[PDB]
Structures are given as structure tokens and as C-alpha cells.
Enzyme design. Structure first.
Site, mmCIF file in Angstrom:
data_model
loop_
_atom_site.group_PDB
_atom_site.id
_atom_site.type_symbol
_atom_site.label_atom_id
_atom_site.label_comp_id
_atom_site.label_asym_id
_atom_site.label_seq_id
_atom_site.Cartn_x
_atom_site.Cartn_y
_atom_site.Cartn_z
ATOM 1 N N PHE A 1 0.808 -1.208 0.000
ATOM 2 C CA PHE A 1 0.000 0.000 0.000
ATOM 3 C C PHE A 1 0.844 1.263 0.000
ATOM 4 O O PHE A 1 1.798 1.389 0.773
ATOM 5 C CB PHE A 1 -0.875 0.078 1.250
ATOM 6 C CG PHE A 1 -2.023 -0.875 1.277
ATOM 7 C CD1 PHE A 1 -3.137 -0.671 0.477
ATOM 8 C CD2 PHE A 1 -2.015 -1.956 2.150
ATOM 9 C CE1 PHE A 1 -4.214 -1.550 0.526
ATOM 10 C CE2 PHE A 1 -3.091 -2.828 2.210
ATOM 11 C CZ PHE A 1 -4.188 -2.622 1.402
ATOM 12 N N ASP A 2 0.419 2.235 -0.793
ATOM 13 C CA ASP A 2 0.615 3.620 -0.391
ATOM 14 C C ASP A 2 -0.302 3.932 0.784
ATOM 15 O O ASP A 2 -1.440 3.458 0.835
ATOM 16 C CB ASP A 2 0.285 4.568 -1.531
ATOM 17 C CG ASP A 2 0.253 5.996 -1.079
ATOM 18 O OD1 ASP A 2 1.352 6.557 -0.919
ATOM 19 O OD2 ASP A 2 -0.857 6.546 -0.850
ATOM 20 N N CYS A 3 0.179 4.753 1.720
ATOM 21 C CA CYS A 3 -0.673 5.207 2.818
ATOM 22 C C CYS A 3 -1.334 6.552 2.522
ATOM 23 O O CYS A 3 -2.565 6.659 2.502
ATOM 24 C CB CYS A 3 0.132 5.307 4.119
ATOM 25 S SG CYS A 3 -0.886 5.948 5.506
#
Length: 240
Positions: free
Chosen positions: A11-13
Site C-alpha cells: 500500500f501507499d498510505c
């Protein structure tokens, strides 16, 4: 090509799980009030993005709060305002106030049951620890720009992540890179040979907001307008 083929979601956060645009808009309100002007959210995000990207040196600063403090100074200057030390302090520490998207927690709690969950962040580990408290799950692996020595989209961030996951038992073909940013995430994920799930958070909005413009449009294998919709697609795949 099915969601269920993958073992790990990387994931990107900030922009995908945490709604950093709402966080930035909220955090700019004290300074913006002193202008006497009226800004839309899009206008505030345009101001932020034009003033944050220069701070993205090739070598990452240890503390993201220093980027935010420098951005505060730039924005105060652009708005013809004199900087205030207390406002700067509060703005620089504001990541802890940036909210999750309304669908993020329930989606992550579901997907955690079925996938190994990984974070790839340009914002430092201790800030992400504060955001993680709002995300409702523990992440199996967390990789930051400080770990890598560069910010995504540098290819080293993705090879660092791929190698870390290989040592943890996840083959490259079993990674599904899940992120909103075409520029920061899906262009380099494409080049690194990862499969992409594009979470188009600004689907009902105009432009890129706080996200850097991409040089090209990358190929993505999956498209969802939200994390909740990704979770729903997984549920539907298991039902047949």
C-alpha cells in the site's frame, strides 16, 4: 488475472488509506484565516502541492515534520503573511490529525484476513505510527523513504520492497501494489514489473489535488474508486 491470485497488498498510505488532502486542508485553516481570503479545498491543495514538491530532495530528510514546517513558511510567504511560530509548530505536527477515508478501516480489516499487508511511505515511520493507530490493522511490513535512501517514484524504493518481501516469503508475482498515485506508485510499479490496483480517490473531483502530475498514464490491472470497493470485489470473487 484475479485479485485472489495475490498474497500481499503493498500500500501507499497517504492519499490511499489516510486522506491526506482533508488533513492538509484542515491543517491550513489557521494560516488561511489570517489572509481574509476564501479558498476552496482544491485551491489549498494546489498551493500545498506547488510548495511541497521542491522540498522532496533526492536524499530524504529524517523527519517529515521538517518538510511541513518549510511548506508552512513558503505558504505564509505566498499569502503575504508573516509566519507565526505557534502556527508553524502545529502545522508541522499535523500528520497525527490527518483522517482515514471513511471506508479505509473496514476495508483493511477485511483484507487483513486474506492478504499480507505492507506499507510503502514517503512520510517517516514515527508519523506513520500515529496514522497507523487510526487504520485499525497491524501491517506486516513497513518500508519508508528513510529506509531506502530515496523517495518513491525512485525505482530503488520498489526494488527495496520487492527484496524485503522475497526474504519474507512473498514472490514478486504475488504482490499487488495498491495505491492512488499514478506518479509516485503506479508508474514505478509498472517499471518494476508489479501488478497494480489503482484506488482512484479523486474519482468525483477535478484534477490531481495534492498529488504530483504523472509523466505518462501507467497500465493498471485493477481499478477501484475506494478501498471499500476493492474489498467488495474480493468478497464477490470468493462467492462466485
Amino acid at each position: 488475472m484475479q485479485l485472489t491470485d495475490f498474497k500481499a497488498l503493498t500500500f501507499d498510505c497517504y492519499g490511499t488509506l489516510i486522506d491526506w488532502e482533508t488533513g492538509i486542508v484542515n491543517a491550513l485553516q489557521p494560516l488561511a484565516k489570517r489572509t481574509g481570503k476564501t479558498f476552496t479545498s482544491d485551491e489549498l491543495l494546489e498551493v500545498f502541492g506547488r510548495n511541497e514538491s521542491p522540498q522532496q530532495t533526492e536524499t530524504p530528510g529524517a523527519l517529515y515534520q521538517d518538510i511541513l514546517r518549510a511548506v508552512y513558511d513558503r505558504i505564509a510567504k505566498e499569502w503575504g503573511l508573516e509566519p507565526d511560530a505557534a502556527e508553524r509548530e502545529e502545522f508541522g505536527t499535523s500528520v497525527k490529525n490527518w483522517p482515514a477515508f471513511p471506508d479505509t478501516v473496514e476495508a483493511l480489516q477485511y483484507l487483513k484476513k486474506h492478504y499480507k499487508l505492507v506499507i510503502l511511505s514517503n512520510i517517516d515511520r514515527n508519523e506513520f505510527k500515529l496514522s497507523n493507530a487510526k487504520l485499525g490493522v497491524e501491517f506486516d511490513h513497513i518500508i519508508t523513504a528513510q529506509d531506502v535512501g530515496s523517495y518513491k517514484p525512485n525505482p530503488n524504493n520498489f526494488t527495496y520492497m520487492i527484496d524485503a518481501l522475497a526474504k519474507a516469503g512473498i514472490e514478486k508475482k504475488d504482490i499487488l501494489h495498491t495505491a492512488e498515485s499514478l506518479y509516485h506508485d503506479h508508474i514505478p510499479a509498472n517499471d518494476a514489473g508489479l501488478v497494480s490496483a489503482w484506488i482512484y480517490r479523486r474519482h468525483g473531483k477535478e484534477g490531481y489535488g495534492a498529488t504530483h502530475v504523472p509523466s505518462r498514464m501507467p497500465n493498471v490491472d485493477f481499478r477501484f474508486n475506494s478501498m471499500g470497493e476493492m474489498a467488495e470485489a474480493h468478497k464477490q470473487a470468493l462467492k462466485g
